[PDB]
Amino acid sequence: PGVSVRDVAAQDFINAYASFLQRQGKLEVPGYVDIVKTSSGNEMPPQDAEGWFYKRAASVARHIYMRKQVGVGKLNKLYGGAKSRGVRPYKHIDASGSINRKVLQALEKIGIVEISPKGGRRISENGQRDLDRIAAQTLEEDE
Amino acid sequence: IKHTLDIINVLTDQNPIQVVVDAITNTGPREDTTRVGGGGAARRQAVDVSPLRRVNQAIALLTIGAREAAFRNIKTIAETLAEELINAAKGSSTSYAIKKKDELERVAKSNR
Amino acid sequence: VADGVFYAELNEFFTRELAEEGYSGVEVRVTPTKTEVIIRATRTQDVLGENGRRINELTLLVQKRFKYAPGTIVLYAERVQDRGLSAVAQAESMKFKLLNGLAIRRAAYGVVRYVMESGAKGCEVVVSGKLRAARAKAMKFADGFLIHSGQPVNDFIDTATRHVLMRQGVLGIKVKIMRDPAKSR
Amino acid sequence: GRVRTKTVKRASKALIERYYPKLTLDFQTNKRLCDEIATIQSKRLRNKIAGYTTHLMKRIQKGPVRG
Amino acid sequence: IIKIRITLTSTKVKQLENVSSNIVKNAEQHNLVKKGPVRLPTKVLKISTRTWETYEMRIHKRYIDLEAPVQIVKRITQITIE
Amino acid sequence: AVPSVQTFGKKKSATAVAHVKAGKGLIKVNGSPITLVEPEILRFKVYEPLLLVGLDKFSNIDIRVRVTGGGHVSQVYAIRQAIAKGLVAYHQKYVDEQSKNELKKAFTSYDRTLLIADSRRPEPKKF
Amino acid sequence: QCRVCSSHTGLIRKYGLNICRQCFREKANDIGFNKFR
RNA sequence: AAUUGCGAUAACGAACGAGACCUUAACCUACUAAAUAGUGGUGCUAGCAUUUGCUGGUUAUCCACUUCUUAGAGGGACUAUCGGUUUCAAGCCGAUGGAAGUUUGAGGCAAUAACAGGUCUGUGAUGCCCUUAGACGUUCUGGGCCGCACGCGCGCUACACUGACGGAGCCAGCGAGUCUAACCUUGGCCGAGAGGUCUUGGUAAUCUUGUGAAACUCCGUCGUGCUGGGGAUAGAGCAUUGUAAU
């Protein structure tokens, strides 16, 4: 009966954990958040202009806790959008690597994600503890 | 369909599945016309269409009327389809398939 | 002595490359750094050809193909008959089969089967003498098509007689094989 | 139109004309009968012959058919 | 004592099963420890050729582990050439 | 050893292998709860092999589902079929035959897909 | 480019074997892609 | 389904036909068998609540197995059976059992009767214009093969609110991959991106790969307005392959 990330919903976990990271604020947030869209297969920057980066980091940390390890190209593949090419149809386009690198440096600087000797970003046991605790608090929101 | 059954609940029809079945019943053209040869000037003769085809025909007319009504307006597919099923569960001639059922049956009665 | 892998690979190369030059078998002996592969042969005038042919052709083909310089290996030839067309080798084989406990019928079927698989127009094996009985018996085993009169007897059919000594008595093997007249050459 | 080929008709008819009482109304024993009693090279054409023996045995136990 | 894995491939099943069974019989008759013939998936290499048609090829693969000295491995590898 | 039954369940190249062991009454699909299926619409479909028999049939068993292949609808039908198959196979091999017949009758009378594998495959396109 | 018998018409340019569809069905019984279905 | 058979009957035989031969599909918790596939138990190990548990890391920690992946052996289907229809015959149709019941479905295979159908860089004191100042052979540059009142046609993208945008979830399979070369690329840093850097894995069921594809699911922005649908056309720069991108 362990309260963990494996029990909560996806979008609720991302909303809650992004809210905890917003109220903390103790991460590495760049200055091109208001400037740069998350992928070249987009027209407009994300609507949560002051807070889409925390949503991005919450999605990343949730995607890391559930599996062995991730990379930058894997998270570029995960975000991938159907891009219109005008008169040409939609095609799959991977996202920017800079957002992945800065999210993983922000979550590695706080001590949640860590580089694993298979060349991969894995969840730290402190990050395991923190995500399981906030998932427990997300479950306690539901009482 | 789930949104539509919710709407038919909130529009004071406690049995939305019965609203669906009554719209199936009250919008089925019993008899229609076929285009016989007729000797050049091809008249149309009233045949008495099968009740399986009456079910097919009623569902087709309702989906066509709902797709006509929900296209090019703010009003959603669920609200238009619920409006059609409520105005068609009991014959009111403010829906689609009631009117076209009446048109097919009056062509059938005129052409027997 | 070279291995049977090399011998079977030359069998594979010859069976696909000497398809209409009469590749009967391969005799092979190895002296120090010289492997002598004698192509045992149906008809050898396909092998020798017009003024020296298939031996030079296959020698240069192995030197061009199997990356051999002239001087390492050597290719020889000998003139014999086809083992199936010849009544002598088939009579040796019939004597062999009768001396190893195989009866008249299965040995006759095997030898006639091998002759007809070789490519002879026909053959006949005549078996005489006594087999486990006092009374003597003779048995004809003919197949294909044979002729019995005239100058084509001297031209086309080979005959061989063998006295095969068994524990009871002696048997007379008479092998008569008709070679293909189109392949007379 | 599943018309039986000539080999199946003739073989099944011959197996019932000569070898009637061994054959039965059941396909699975007449199949083993056609396995044991005729040299059929393929299982499929043996099944063809055996089921046609089964059908003709169903027909002949009602009355004498022209064998 | 050398542990060598033999990876065999063929197009036809009967000669490949014959070669594998000969490996099994000969490595069993003089007490060699071994893994059984592991049968890889038959890969289906196809070409769509000019309606349209399809050309096919089945490729069958086995592999057998053996543990034997140099003499037995060399005689097995030489004799089993088919 | 905990008494467990290992049983497949397939839908459209989507294989969900189910491990029904003797446990607390715990159900997981791919290490995710049965409350959380990736489509919200198909959710009660996964509840269809559950409530068609009852809920006290489940407290004795810890249920595992691990899935390969398919799509979104295909995996849902695969996991609900695998739940039904693992449940009736547990109640066949360990529990008596009659309860297995009752569970298979309850599954068969509503949806025979939950016990019988499907066949709607994409045909070879007939060159 | 046909490097075998100067037969550019219908090269099969896949995998660099580069045989024309006329001569590819000449040499079809040497590689192994034959008629099954 | 057929000139396939029955039957009457100047009738009596045989061949190629056609059926038929080959190759495929589906069900096999009954075989036979596994570290280039997987599942479970079990060691070492990480987090969470602890009352037993959940999520896992661990190309050897061992075992079992093929339930799923896979190689075959076989098996099965032969219209099995029932009832209409049919000289109540070869057969057809409706229904049941069956993995499969329309010939379970497709394609290759001959013999006989048409192809000047398309060349062989073929041989023959072959016929015949010249025998060569011809380029037929070679080059080497730069423009073409794309040009535009228009006609014949196929496709892509739209005319949106069962929709566009902004997020999230992240579901497959067929393939394919480098040697005496620069293939497929994982990962890490830089860049808004394009891309770049540094390596690493895989000659392959192993790495790319679980190809985390797209459509799809959910939540917010939009509010019917050629609109936030559309993206044609055009400007500016920045990068990549190519000798050379006008």
JSON list of C-alpha atoms in Angstrom, two decimals, chain F residues 13-123:
[
{"chain": "F", "resi": 13, "resn": "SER", "atom": "CA", "xyz": [-1.49, -7.78, -32.17]},
{"chain": "F", "resi": 14, "resn": "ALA", "atom": "CA", "xyz": [-1.95, -6.50, -28.59]},
{"chain": "F", "resi": 15, "resn": "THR", "atom": "CA", "xyz": [-1.00, -9.23, -26.14]},
{"chain": "F", "resi": 16, "resn": "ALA", "atom": "CA", "xyz": [-1.76, -8.67, -22.45]},
{"chain": "F", "resi": 17, "resn": "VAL", "atom": "CA", "xyz": [-0.28, -11.43, -20.30]},
{"chain": "F", "resi": 18, "resn": "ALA", "atom": "CA", "xyz": [-2.08, -11.74, -16.97]},
{"chain": "F", "resi": 19, "resn": "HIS", "atom": "CA", "xyz": [-0.68, -13.23, -13.76]},
{"chain": "F", "resi": 20, "resn": "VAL", "atom": "CA", "xyz": [-3.51, -14.02, -11.34]},
{"chain": "F", "resi": 21, "resn": "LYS", "atom": "CA", "xyz": [-1.89, -14.99, -8.03]},
{"chain": "F", "resi": 22, "resn": "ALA", "atom": "CA", "xyz": [-3.35, -15.40, -4.55]},
{"chain": "F", "resi": 23, "resn": "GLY", "atom": "CA", "xyz": [-3.19, -11.90, -3.10]},
{"chain": "F", "resi": 24, "resn": "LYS", "atom": "CA", "xyz": [-4.84, -8.94, -1.39]},
{"chain": "F", "resi": 25, "resn": "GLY", "atom": "CA", "xyz": [-7.43, -8.06, -4.02]},
{"chain": "F", "resi": 26, "resn": "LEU", "atom": "CA", "xyz": [-5.10, -5.88, -6.04]},
{"chain": "F", "resi": 27, "resn": "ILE", "atom": "CA", "xyz": [-5.41, -5.24, -9.78]},
{"chain": "F", "resi": 28, "resn": "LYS", "atom": "CA", "xyz": [-2.71, -3.62, -11.92]},
{"chain": "F", "resi": 29, "resn": "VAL", "atom": "CA", "xyz": [-2.41, -3.11, -15.67]},
{"chain": "F", "resi": 30, "resn": "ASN", "atom": "CA", "xyz": [1.22, -2.36, -16.72]},
{"chain": "F", "resi": 31, "resn": "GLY", "atom": "CA", "xyz": [1.92, -1.25, -13.15]},
{"chain": "F", "resi": 32, "resn": "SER", "atom": "CA", "xyz": [-0.95, 1.26, -13.44]},
{"chain": "F", "resi": 33, "resn": "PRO", "atom": "CA", "xyz": [-4.31, 0.87, -11.65]},
{"chain": "F", "resi": 34, "resn": "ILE", "atom": "CA", "xyz": [-7.48, -0.37, -13.28]},
{"chain": "F", "resi": 35, "resn": "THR", "atom": "CA", "xyz": [-9.05, 2.92, -12.14]},
{"chain": "F", "resi": 36, "resn": "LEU", "atom": "CA", "xyz": [-6.73, 4.67, -14.63]},
{"chain": "F", "resi": 37, "resn": "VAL", "atom": "CA", "xyz": [-7.05, 3.34, -18.19]},
{"chain": "F", "resi": 38, "resn": "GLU", "atom": "CA", "xyz": [-5.55, 5.61, -20.86]},
{"chain": "F", "resi": 39, "resn": "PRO", "atom": "CA", "xyz": [-8.87, 6.25, -22.66]},
{"chain": "F", "resi": 40, "resn": "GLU", "atom": "CA", "xyz": [-11.59, 7.64, -20.40]},
{"chain": "F", "resi": 41, "resn": "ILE", "atom": "CA", "xyz": [-14.39, 6.46, -22.71]},
{"chain": "F", "resi": 42, "resn": "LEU", "atom": "CA", "xyz": [-13.45, 2.75, -22.75]},
{"chain": "F", "resi": 43, "resn": "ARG", "atom": "CA", "xyz": [-12.97, 2.68, -18.95]},
{"chain": "F", "resi": 44, "resn": "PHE", "atom": "CA", "xyz": [-16.15, 0.79, -18.00]},
{"chain": "F", "resi": 45, "resn": "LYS", "atom": "CA", "xyz": [-15.33, -1.75, -20.74]},
{"chain": "F", "resi": 46, "resn": "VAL", "atom": "CA", "xyz": [-12.43, -2.85, -18.54]},
{"chain": "F", "resi": 47, "resn": "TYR", "atom": "CA", "xyz": [-14.99, -2.99, -15.72]},
{"chain": "F", "resi": 48, "resn": "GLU", "atom": "CA", "xyz": [-17.19, -5.27, -17.85]},
{"chain": "F", "resi": 49, "resn": "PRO", "atom": "CA", "xyz": [-15.32, -8.53, -16.97]},
{"chain": "F", "resi": 50, "resn": "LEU", "atom": "CA", "xyz": [-15.32, -7.33, -13.33]},
{"chain": "F", "resi": 51, "resn": "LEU", "atom": "CA", "xyz": [-18.92, -6.48, -12.39]},
{"chain": "F", "resi": 52, "resn": "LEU", "atom": "CA", "xyz": [-20.50, -9.14, -14.62]},
{"chain": "F", "resi": 53, "resn": "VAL", "atom": "CA", "xyz": [-19.67, -11.73, -11.93]},
{"chain": "F", "resi": 54, "resn": "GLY", "atom": "CA", "xyz": [-19.14, -9.77, -8.71]},
{"chain": "F", "resi": 55, "resn": "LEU", "atom": "CA", "xyz": [-16.48, -8.28, -6.49]},
{"chain": "F", "resi": 56, "resn": "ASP", "atom": "CA", "xyz": [-15.90, -10.90, -3.79]},
{"chain": "F", "resi": 57, "resn": "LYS", "atom": "CA", "xyz": [-14.33, -13.09, -6.50]},
{"chain": "F", "resi": 58, "resn": "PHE", "atom": "CA", "xyz": [-11.41, -10.63, -6.52]},
{"chain": "F", "resi": 59, "resn": "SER", "atom": "CA", "xyz": [-10.31, -10.20, -2.87]},
{"chain": "F", "resi": 60, "resn": "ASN", "atom": "CA", "xyz": [-8.51, -13.57, -3.02]},
{"chain": "F", "resi": 61, "resn": "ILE", "atom": "CA", "xyz": [-6.38, -12.67, -6.05]},
{"chain": "F", "resi": 62, "resn": "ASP", "atom": "CA", "xyz": [-3.66, -10.17, -6.89]},
{"chain": "F", "resi": 63, "resn": "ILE", "atom": "CA", "xyz": [-3.97, -9.55, -10.62]},
{"chain": "F", "resi": 64, "resn": "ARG", "atom": "CA", "xyz": [-1.13, -8.53, -12.96]},
{"chain": "F", "resi": 65, "resn": "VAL", "atom": "CA", "xyz": [-1.47, -7.37, -16.56]},
{"chain": "F", "resi": 66, "resn": "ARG", "atom": "CA", "xyz": [1.52, -6.59, -18.79]},
{"chain": "F", "resi": 67, "resn": "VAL", "atom": "CA", "xyz": [0.86, -5.44, -22.36]},
{"chain": "F", "resi": 68, "resn": "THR", "atom": "CA", "xyz": [2.75, -5.41, -25.67]},
{"chain": "F", "resi": 69, "resn": "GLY", "atom": "CA", "xyz": [1.64, -4.01, -29.02]},
{"chain": "F", "resi": 70, "resn": "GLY", "atom": "CA", "xyz": [-1.66, -2.79, -30.41]},
{"chain": "F", "resi": 71, "resn": "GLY", "atom": "CA", "xyz": [-3.23, 0.65, -30.23]},
{"chain": "F", "resi": 72, "resn": "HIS", "atom": "CA", "xyz": [-5.55, 2.32, -27.71]},
{"chain": "F", "resi": 73, "resn": "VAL", "atom": "CA", "xyz": [-8.85, 0.47, -28.19]},
{"chain": "F", "resi": 74, "resn": "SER", "atom": "CA", "xyz": [-7.02, -2.78, -28.97]},
{"chain": "F", "resi": 75, "resn": "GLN", "atom": "CA", "xyz": [-5.15, -2.77, -25.66]},
{"chain": "F", "resi": 76, "resn": "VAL", "atom": "CA", "xyz": [-8.39, -2.06, -23.75]},
{"chain": "F", "resi": 77, "resn": "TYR", "atom": "CA", "xyz": [-10.14, -5.04, -25.32]},
{"chain": "F", "resi": 78, "resn": "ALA", "atom": "CA", "xyz": [-6.97, -7.09, -24.79]},
{"chain": "F", "resi": 79, "resn": "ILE", "atom": "CA", "xyz": [-6.78, -6.30, -21.07]},
{"chain": "F", "resi": 80, "resn": "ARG", "atom": "CA", "xyz": [-10.49, -6.90, -20.39]},
{"chain": "F", "resi": 81, "resn": "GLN", "atom": "CA", "xyz": [-10.31, -10.22, -22.28]},
{"chain": "F", "resi": 82, "resn": "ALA", "atom": "CA", "xyz": [-7.13, -11.10, -20.35]},
{"chain": "F", "resi": 83, "resn": "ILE", "atom": "CA", "xyz": [-8.84, -10.28, -17.03]},
{"chain": "F", "resi": 84, "resn": "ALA", "atom": "CA", "xyz": [-11.76, -12.57, -17.91]},
{"chain": "F", "resi": 85, "resn": "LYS", "atom": "CA", "xyz": [-9.45, -15.39, -19.09]},
{"chain": "F", "resi": 86, "resn": "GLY", "atom": "CA", "xyz": [-7.15, -15.18, -16.06]},
{"chain": "F", "resi": 87, "resn": "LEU", "atom": "CA", "xyz": [-10.15, -15.11, -13.72]},
{"chain": "F", "resi": 88, "resn": "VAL", "atom": "CA", "xyz": [-11.78, -18.20, -15.23]},
{"chain": "F", "resi": 89, "resn": "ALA", "atom": "CA", "xyz": [-8.41, -19.98, -15.45]},
{"chain": "F", "resi": 90, "resn": "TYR", "atom": "CA", "xyz": [-7.74, -19.30, -11.76]},
{"chain": "F", "resi": 91, "resn": "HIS", "atom": "CA", "xyz": [-11.20, -20.59, -10.93]},
{"chain": "F", "resi": 92, "resn": "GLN", "atom": "CA", "xyz": [-10.60, -23.60, -13.20]},
{"chain": "F", "resi": 93, "resn": "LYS", "atom": "CA", "xyz": [-7.19, -24.88, -12.15]},
{"chain": "F", "resi": 94, "resn": "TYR", "atom": "CA", "xyz": [-7.29, -24.10, -8.41]},
{"chain": "F", "resi": 95, "resn": "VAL", "atom": "CA", "xyz": [-10.96, -23.48, -7.57]},
{"chain": "F", "resi": 96, "resn": "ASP", "atom": "CA", "xyz": [-13.58, -26.12, -8.47]},
{"chain": "F", "resi": 97, "resn": "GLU", "atom": "CA", "xyz": [-15.07, -26.69, -11.92]},
{"chain": "F", "resi": 98, "resn": "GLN", "atom": "CA", "xyz": [-18.61, -25.47, -11.12]},
{"chain": "F", "resi": 99, "resn": "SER", "atom": "CA", "xyz": [-17.61, -21.93, -10.11]},
{"chain": "F", "resi": 100, "resn": "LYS", "atom": "CA", "xyz": [-15.53, -21.78, -13.30]},
{"chain": "F", "resi": 101, "resn": "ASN", "atom": "CA", "xyz": [-18.63, -22.79, -15.29]},
{"chain": "F", "resi": 102, "resn": "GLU", "atom": "CA", "xyz": [-20.64, -20.06, -13.53]},
{"chain": "F", "resi": 103, "resn": "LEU", "atom": "CA", "xyz": [-18.01, -17.40, -14.31]},
{"chain": "F", "resi": 104, "resn": "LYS", "atom": "CA", "xyz": [-17.69, -18.60, -17.91]},
{"chain": "F", "resi": 105, "resn": "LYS", "atom": "CA", "xyz": [-21.48, -18.61, -18.24]},
{"chain": "F", "resi": 106, "resn": "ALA", "atom": "CA", "xyz": [-21.70, -15.04, -16.94]},
{"chain": "F", "resi": 107, "resn": "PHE", "atom": "CA", "xyz": [-18.96, -13.98, -19.37]},
{"chain": "F", "resi": 108, "resn": "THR", "atom": "CA", "xyz": [-20.37, -15.96, -22.32]},
{"chain": "F", "resi": 109, "resn": "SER", "atom": "CA", "xyz": [-23.97, -14.75, -21.93]},
{"chain": "F", "resi": 110, "resn": "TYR", "atom": "CA", "xyz": [-22.95, -11.07, -22.20]},
{"chain": "F", "resi": 111, "resn": "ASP", "atom": "CA", "xyz": [-19.76, -10.88, -24.30]},
{"chain": "F", "resi": 112, "resn": "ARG", "atom": "CA", "xyz": [-18.09, -13.95, -25.84]},
{"chain": "F", "resi": 113, "resn": "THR", "atom": "CA", "xyz": [-15.09, -11.77, -26.80]},
{"chain": "F", "resi": 114, "resn": "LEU", "atom": "CA", "xyz": [-13.94, -11.88, -23.15]},
{"chain": "F", "resi": 115, "resn": "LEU", "atom": "CA", "xyz": [-13.39, -15.66, -23.36]},
{"chain": "F", "resi": 116, "resn": "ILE", "atom": "CA", "xyz": [-12.86, -16.34, -27.09]},
{"chain": "F", "resi": 117, "resn": "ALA", "atom": "CA", "xyz": [-10.09, -14.82, -29.20]},
{"chain": "F", "resi": 118, "resn": "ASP", "atom": "CA", "xyz": [-11.14, -12.58, -32.09]},
{"chain": "F", "resi": 119, "resn": "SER", "atom": "CA", "xyz": [-10.43, -12.91, -35.82]},
{"chain": "F", "resi": 120, "resn": "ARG", "atom": "CA", "xyz": [-10.98, -9.49, -37.48]},
{"chain": "F", "resi": 121, "resn": "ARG", "atom": "CA", "xyz": [-7.53, -9.24, -38.97]},
{"chain": "F", "resi": 122, "resn": "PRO", "atom": "CA", "xyz": [-6.40, -7.03, -41.85]},
{"chain": "F", "resi": 123, "resn": "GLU", "atom": "CA", "xyz": [-6.34, -9.34, -44.85]}
]
